[PDB]
Structure 1
């Protein structure tokens, strides 16, 4: 059934994942010395390429590959169109490893044919709370706590093979070469998400959306007027009214984050994330990188009253190409990123996120039911989508957990 994933150090079945009690590695300990120094073999017509992410032109080539060949919805109505500014942000965080960005080009014309990216992350990935309890009950605490320390691992994203090169087993070769490059830096685990079901997720959550521009969403068939709107004389008018938001934020004290906020944001975020079983640990430089506002990419607001930052939220933009329609050629989506509330209810904080996103011309707000995202779904009129995001580790045995115990946002 899985000619590639059966050869890899991942859980092979759902059962296996449901049996796992303690976090830890799957494969045998290896050193950097054990790992081949030479790139994985590839067909003579292709070549490995390491793009320079601080080269506008290299970013551009990656951008076009993804624009034309990255994830679509199941109806081929929308294809993500991550911007070049977004890709530089995502691909080049503090202390990134240039060699973890792996491309394949056709040797002749040097056409970019495939890509995968890895970036560093520091992740808490030790045994979940409810397994450390079963463990104490069992007299098995030391084993349960062995890998409690945050680990410096790899987060994989943006795997993409050109449409003309599909179903030729190129994706496995990319994954093998990325693994080699990561392993050669003495990193042995990776975390990745996908919409598809592979062997084998440790958590899975539904997608949710909140309409901001229902008129447009209906036009492009992102949305359809649901059946109960038919018993109305003007269904569209009732839909627009349903999703209407204030023109201006409601929280006094709300403003954009600035560099001086970085310590307080790091502290309140770390306190909040601490509480989930799987979650990132950020340095000040990483808080700066992932949360300070960047035009068209990431938008972050703090609640400061009394010279004190008590709350914040962030969202990032990913537009999609609208493949079919031609009144509109882009869907402009805002995604809930990190947040922390200490002074106001989370629904009141995130309402301001929707107000701001709508004000700035976003069409829809998306999120997965990670973090405490479920706590504001109904009041803020989110609906579940058809999709799920599945979370996976490479080379890491981990108990199945609920998505509300996951605190890692993946771009």
Structure 2
């Protein structure tokens, strides 16, 4: 059934997955020395390309490939339109490896045809807590703790094959060449997410959306007026009323994050993420990179009364193309990013997120049910969307966990 994934070091069935009790590798340990020096052979009409992310033109080429060919919703009404500034931020964290950005171009004109990207991430990915309890009961605590230390691995994103090249098994070649490049740096695990079912996820979660401009959402058919609203004389006016927000934040102390907050946000964030089974470990340079505000891309606010950062939240922006509306070209969506609350309840912190996003002209706020995102879905009037996001490892055996035990946000 899976000619490519059946040759790879991943759990092959949910049964396979059910028998996993400890984290650790799937494969045979290998060395850099064992891995072929040369790129994987490709058809003579194509060529491998490593784009330079410091070069405006190379970012622009990847931006056009994704603008026209990347992920669409299931009804083909919307397609993600990551900006060039977003791609530079996502693709180039501190100590990124330029060789992990893998492209295929057509030789005859240098047209970009396929892309995949890897970035370094440091991830806690040891045995989950529930499985450590079961281990203690069996007397098997040392095996359970072997891979407890944060690991330097690759996070894969942005796999995209041009529409004209679909179903020609081009995706497997990209994945194998990315794997070769990552392995040649002595990294043997990757983490990736997808909104498709592949062999075989370690967690799965629903998407959630919070309307901020319901009249536009209904006009572009992101949203429907629900049936229940028909009992009203003016269904749309009641819908707008239901989702209305304050103009200004409720928490005094709220202000944009600035560089001097980095150490305190790193502290409160790392203390929070600690509670989760799978989650990233960020250095000060990484906190700086992923959280300091960047126009049009990432927005971060802290709660500081009496000169101490006690809470913060962040969100990032991705516009989507609206495929053929006379009125609207773009859906401007905000995505919940990392956050930590130590002094106020999380629903009150995220309410300020929604108020900030609405004030800045976003149409909808989106999130996956990771972190503690469930604790605020009802009060903050989030609705479950369609389908599920699945989380995967490459070359890592891992027990199934709940999405509330996952703390890695994928951009």
TM tier, smaller: over 0.9
Aligned alpha-carbon RMSD (Å)? 0.4
C-alpha separation in 2, matches of 1:310 and 1:343: 6
Shift of 1:19: 1.5
Aligned-partner SS, 1:365: strand
Tell me if 1:180 matches 2:180. Answer: yes
C-alpha separation in 2, matches of 1:294 and 1:17: 40
Tell me if 1:356 matches 2:350. Answer: no
Q: Deviations over 1:45-86 (max 9, x none)?
A: 000000000101000000000000000011100000000000
Equivalence for 1:328: 328
Q: Deviations over 1:232-284 (max 9, x none)?
A: 00000000000000000000100000000000000000000000000000000
Q: Give the 5 Å matches for 1:329-348.
A: 329-348=329-348
Aligned-partner SS, 2:231: coil
When normalised by structure 2's length, the TM-score is 1.00
Aligned-partner SS, 1:381: coil
Q: Deviations over 1:282-314 (max 9, x none)?
A: 000000000000000000000000000000000
Q: How many residues are aligned here? A: 411
**Which 10-residue stretch deviates more, 316-325 or 287-296?**
316-325
Q: Deviations over 1:181-221 (max 9, x none)?
A: 00000000000000000000000000000000000000000
Shift of 1:324: 2.7
C-alpha separation in 2, matches of 1:86 and 1:80: 12
Q: Deviations over 1:356-409 (max 9, x none)?
A: 000000000000000000000000000000121100000000000000000000
Q: Deviations over 1:327-368 (max 9, x none)?
A: 000000000000000000000000000000000000000000
Aligned-partner SS, 1:6: helix
C-alpha separation in 1, matches of 2:113 and 2:382: 37
Equivalence for 2:276: 276
Shift of 1:18: 1.5
Q: Unmatched 5+ residue regions in structure 1?
A: none
**Which 10-residue stretch deviates more, 321-330 or 294-303?**
321-330
Aligned-partner SS, 1:332: strand
C-alpha separation in 1, matches of 2:28 and 2:3: 21
C-alpha separation in 2, matches of 1:173 and 1:47: 12
Aligned-partner SS, 2:408: coil
Shift of 1:15: 1.2
Q: Unmatched 5+ residue regions in structure 2?
A: none
C-alpha separation in 2, matches of 1:326 and 1:39: 46
Shift of 1:326: 2.0
C-alpha separation in 2, matches of 1:45 and 1:176: 19
Equivalence for 2:199: 199
Aligned-partner SS, 2:299: strand
Aligned-partner SS, 1:113: strand
C-alpha separation in 2, matches of 1:401 and 1:82: 30
Aligned-partner SS, 2:366: strand
Q: Deviations over 1:132-187 (max 9, x none)?
A: 11001101011000000000000000000000000000000000000000000000
Aligned-partner SS, 1:137: helix
Equivalence for 1:370: 370
Equivalence for 2:132: 132
Aligned-partner SS, 1:248: coil
Which consecutive segments of 4 or more residues in structure 1 shift more than 6 A?
none
Aligned-partner SS, 1:230: helix
C-alpha separation in 1, matches of 2:64 and 2:127: 40
Shift of 1:16: 1.1
Shift of 1:325: 1.2
C-alpha separation in 1, matches of 2:18 and 2:313: 34
